[PDB]
Each structure stands twice: as structure tokens, then as C-alpha cells.
């Protein structure tokens, strides 16, 4: 199981965008389709 903050760190690292923090927040906020 990947913890939420670990998942965030991994996403930010792989993303490579200074926008990653907000982008992650949007993924958590929006339902998956």
C-alpha cells in the first residue's frame, strides 16, 4: 500500500512540472473516469 504523501512525492518526482502540487490536488479532488 502506497501512502498518500508517498504517492504525492512520487507523482511530483515523475511529473517534472512545477505545477505538480496543484495537479495532484486536482487528481484527488476529481472523480476518476
Amino acid at each position: 500500500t502506497i501512502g498518500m504523501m508517498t504517492l504525492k512525492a512520487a507523482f511530483k518526482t515523475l511529473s517534472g512540472a512545477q505545477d505538480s502540487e496543484a495537479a495532484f490536488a486536482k487528481l484527488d479532488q476529481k472523480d476518476l473516469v
Binding site: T1, I2, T6, L7, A10, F11, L14, L27, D31, L32
Partner: protein, 93 residues
Amino acid sequence: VSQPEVGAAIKIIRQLMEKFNLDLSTVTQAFLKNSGELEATSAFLASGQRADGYPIWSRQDDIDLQKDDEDTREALVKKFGAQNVARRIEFRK
């Protein structure tokens, strides 16, 4: 968060991206709706359903989860099962 934890997560995320040919966001969002569980997330990405016979989490469910209301919590338990609800609280902590 420790470097080892992030490295392990990155490895898993990358494998899933290649195995199912999906972008970073799709895989990451799937983990978020499955409370970071590998099996459930992979089963979900492969079939569209978790392997335990329960749905993934939605925004309304997460909002409901924080309501100090017995009726709301019972409805969540019926929809996800007591175990998944406990794991969600822990995941969201």
C-alpha cells in the same frame, strides 16, 4: 516521506504505466481512488472493478467520510464494507 518509500512507489507506478499503457496521472489517480492499494488498483486498471466486490472512492464519499453522523457512516459501511472504510480513514489521515 523517506527516499526508499518514494523509490518503491515510483517503481510500481512506472510498471503499471507500461503494463497498461497509461499516463502518469491516470495511474496516480487510480491509486488515489483505491487508497494506495496495489492489488485493487491493478485489478481496477485491468478490468474496471476492484477485486474485492466494492466500488472505488468518489469525492462525495470522501466528504461523507468526514461527517460526524451515524447514518452517514452506516451508509458508507454498506457501500464499501467496514474494512475499506477503516483503510480510507487511515489513507486520508
